[PDB]
Amino acid sequence: GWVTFYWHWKHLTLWQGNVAQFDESSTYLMGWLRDYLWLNSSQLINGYNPFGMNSLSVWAWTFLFGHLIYATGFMFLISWRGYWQELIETLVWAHEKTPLANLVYWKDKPVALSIVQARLVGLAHFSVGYIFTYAAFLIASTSGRFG
Amino acid sequence: WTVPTLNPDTPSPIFGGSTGGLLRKAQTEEFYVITWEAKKEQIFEMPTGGAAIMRQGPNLLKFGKKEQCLALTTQLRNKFKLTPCFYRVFPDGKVQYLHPADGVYPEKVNAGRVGANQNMRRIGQNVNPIKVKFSGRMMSPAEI
């Protein structure tokens, strides 16, 4: 991420001819947050708005799509198995006692994900949300600016 | 000592009931029955939640898994100083007895028991995983 932020910001300023912005604003971390992430999101998040939409609405939608998959990964990484296995046990009780639904039944006993599985599942959501968020921003910021 | 025979007509403690009891598993796979003698009527804690009163004399309870039976056994033994025993009961009507397997609780050494899964070496003397590779299944060096 640091490598690709560095490559992208140093090139956007070159492609606009104003390399001085990177030279001046890149020496402190507020410049990155202000002049790179916040400044270049203006067109992305306007892909669709209460007045209409344009060709960037797919990247605007994918941008939030990434934030959601990323945040969902936190659930598998922060909360661990013991909580969920005990919650599923009341769901098993509820199904068996519900009339007109206990006629249907499962063949595989429901259980919580394993300890190792949830780390992979959480890491997969974390990575996917990571990738899709920056891919939408990278393409939208670069293409809208010039393309 | 001889293997006890379960009496299905044994009275059960005074308990209102709860939602933490047996499920459909008991009717299809198995369930567990714990029995003991009570010197006097007393209140104890059900592993499934709530409080129950044990009748004086024999008592019988049914639980969904073995750990629940042995959790109640620890309470009765440690606090009320009783001596319970529980079985495994199958839907076909068969009854299997366990704990105490030979009548003496496992914490106390008893003659006649045969050592099982005992390795006459230390943990540090196991072979490397490469030497148990392609043995037909995932096998730890401790198994061999």
Next chain:
Amino acid sequence: AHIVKIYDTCIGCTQCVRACPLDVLEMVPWDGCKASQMASAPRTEDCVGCKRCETACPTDFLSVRVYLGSESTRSMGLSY
């Protein structure tokens, strides 16, 4: 079913047997230690893998080891 092994460094303290919440372990006579008793694992089909026995073993390194293996209704600790 999990795999439980007792190694010859056992001192026969009986703490593993007391700790086990499923009566998987028991003590048997032995001549390899002062206590003249050794831990045994005759009922590993009821083991759930909690590793309370390993928490209770005083010897270093452990004299009782649990290797989680194939899952089942009993080893997965299910009441349904």
Next chain:
Amino acid sequence: AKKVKIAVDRNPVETSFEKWAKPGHFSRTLSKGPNTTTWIWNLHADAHDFDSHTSDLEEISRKVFSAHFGQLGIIFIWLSGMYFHGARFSNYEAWLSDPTHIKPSAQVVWPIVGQEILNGDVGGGFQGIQITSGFFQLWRASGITSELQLYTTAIGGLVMAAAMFFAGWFHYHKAAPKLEWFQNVESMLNHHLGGLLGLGSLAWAGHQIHVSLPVNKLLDAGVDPKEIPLPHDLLLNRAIMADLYPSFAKGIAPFFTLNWSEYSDFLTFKGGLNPVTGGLWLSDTAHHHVAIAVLFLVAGHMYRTNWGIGHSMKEILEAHRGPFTGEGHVGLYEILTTSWHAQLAINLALFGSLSIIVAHHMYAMPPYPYLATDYGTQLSLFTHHTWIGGFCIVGAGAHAAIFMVRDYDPTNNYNNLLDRVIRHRDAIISHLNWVCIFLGFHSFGLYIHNDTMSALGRPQDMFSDTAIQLQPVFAQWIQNTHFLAPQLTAPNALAATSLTWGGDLVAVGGKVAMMPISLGTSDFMVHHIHAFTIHVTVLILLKGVLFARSSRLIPDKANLGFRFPCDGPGRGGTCQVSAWDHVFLGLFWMYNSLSIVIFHFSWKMQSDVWGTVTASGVSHITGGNFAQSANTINGWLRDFLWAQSSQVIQSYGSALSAYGLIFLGAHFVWAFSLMFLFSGRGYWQELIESIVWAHNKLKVAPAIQPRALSITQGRAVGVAHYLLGGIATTWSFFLARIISVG
């Protein structure tokens, strides 16, 4: 019939510094001293866990009583500092003359390393940090007009702080009450209802009637503060008071002759807001505290102590017995007189819920002069007291579970309300589980529906006011009913309690103080988000309490304790089954739910209430974009977070540049916390082994063996940093924003 009496023990403990030099003395485990670094953390973790140090209830109660004196002494130092800094490092006197143009400020920084730029231009020929605590408005309402009056209160605050610390020492080392003393719940309620709340309300009514009302009546008239009569002149000279309020010419005879209507001039029932200052009438506030004083003084004579008359709390509980609930409330009295945790669980729950109610009522009915038009103070106070209420409620779940593990005894609870609740916990959690899933789909799914329809160019298919509509008809009906209350249901009230119900706006100094709030489709959607996130927080906390002792997974969870990491990887894995971990998870969801509450408040106020009044009309800070934009997740990202964070990220080089730094620093602490949440101590203990080897190689290895934090401390360290970083990020963003534009 044990008599209610004072009972103490003489010199229970000796005052010596011996134990100050022996860390861990309180606990048997830690008294032996450290061998690993884990000992150090255990010392601080168990310092205030009195119930685990000793099994004697009397010894526990005595420590609690004196530890409370220490808390009171600390608040007085804090309160004294706030009053002192107002006297010596504030522009309060200048603010009194020009409240609408001068920004309150009570903190000044020294000129070092170039930090003097934080001393901004606040007005009144003064440089300092602008404050949002609202102390200037509070002082004006009480009648404070000089820095001398502020200075004297600070000195009194320190004397009270010294008295509080003496009381704690006295009632632990010299005269410690016995256990039977602490268990007079009937007596304590009588004194705390009629004595603490009752006389406290009456005493404050005396101040308002004799000091606040005369002073604020002249201040509103435009009199120079220095030329107003001093409060003691108003007290000694009935002639002066008669001029302001003619009712004082008749003395107290009307009170004793029941001609209470004579006092109508200063005991009013106007309702609404004072047009000059935009705050509640102080004459209304005085009649409020006089009425509240009588209600509580009557409330303090309900319980029987020593003279027969009154109620026995045990008898009330045992009489309320129905057909559906078995024994009923039997056994609760013994629970609530022998378990401190049970008392703490109730008190935290309602004290926290009260703090949240304070936040809603203070913004809607601004009780202080010039509080409403100070948008920074309005935003800060609402947000502060919502966070306080949120943490207290989560604590209520924490200490309800502690009671369930430690103080719960089945023998005393058989077939009573408490027992029967445990016996259908699966029914409760399974139903509450479904409600949360239902609310998540039908509230957050609507936002996803709108976001997808908007991105597809189908605005007519969205849930909005110009499309498929979701009107809060029930809330709108209540707004109209309260707006018409003075006509028929509250005839003697001149105006509605709040201007949120309806009517006309009140503007002070060209800015809106309060105006009707309209509820539309966006308000419908956001409110059902609140219900969703609150219900989930209940699920997590209630589940922890009901399953604290046992579950279908761990049948003997009580023996493991209240705070343990797991029961091992068996049964598929049992990480985070303890009731402590349900508080740990509940903290995240409380933070998630209150963040939306304070974002809802911030955007709604700027969009629809706050603004500048002009000839044409009201122009709001964000120009009424809440209604059309807050129905999509993209709208919140763009219009709220991205647009309003402009102020904080442009703060460098100005007096607000501090908020910019804390905005970044808060982002850092939050991300730093994910290291503890996403990892486990197994990796870190092995890492320390290699690090220790390097120190051993250089003969510089410590005697106290380094250890990776425990499993539980990793989760506690993670959530504490997660909360601090997240909350501080919003704190910087709110203040830099509202101070800059508001």
Next chain:
Amino acid sequence: GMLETPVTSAPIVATYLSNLPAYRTGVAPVLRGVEIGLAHGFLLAGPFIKLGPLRNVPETAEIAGSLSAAGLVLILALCLSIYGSAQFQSARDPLFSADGWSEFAAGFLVGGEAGVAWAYVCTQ
């Protein structure tokens, strides 16, 4: 035993359930499938017509919504069929068997589509 409760154990509730097609034993599984399918199929058309993407078209709204309700019944019929295949591979009621459920799924498809068609005829 289990926690007794009026909802779980009441006379009026028990009688109502015993008359539902699912619990009414002695009826051929195919006939129960038709009876159940008709009820659900008739209701399934409602939401599609009123809130579908073509809801504001005067005459196309009825056709499009009902045609989508017919599609969902077809998908549900597949779910019923494969459920029987997995569940019953090797008891008192004929329905809970490999032979019974296959007839049940077929009846649901016939009844469900008839209900969707019958719902359309009511509109026009």
Next chain:
Amino acid sequence: DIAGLTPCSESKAYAKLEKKELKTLEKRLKQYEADSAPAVALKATMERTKARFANYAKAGLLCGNDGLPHLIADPGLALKYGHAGEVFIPTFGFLYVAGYIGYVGRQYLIAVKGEAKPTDKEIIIDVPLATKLAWQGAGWPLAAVQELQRGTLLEKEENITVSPR
């Protein structure tokens, strides 16, 4: 000059930067009185700002196109062109203090290992001993080297515990 940089004293952008900062301070000044407390504080800030820009130019720093001082880290370039005070000299300034702190702590840790209860000497510091070791650390580089040559600086490989391999 070096790497295309120019002395700040000769830099146009550097001079313009000083005016911008002083102009900002002056703008705030004119809303106060001549000798009021806020005015005096602002004037003090302006004096430090003028002094700072004179000192950096007098120090012979290099300014880039941004007109901000840049530091030279290569020892050869620093000593060649008199920039030793930017990084090179402060490098040996820090190491002396860093070694001082580390050496003093190591001496104290060895001292208490001989005591009966070393652990209690770590939570509860032996202040008389610590002050004694604090002063003797001024000669740590001499003492540190002599330990290295005598072979008592490092433990023996056979006296250090390691995991199975």
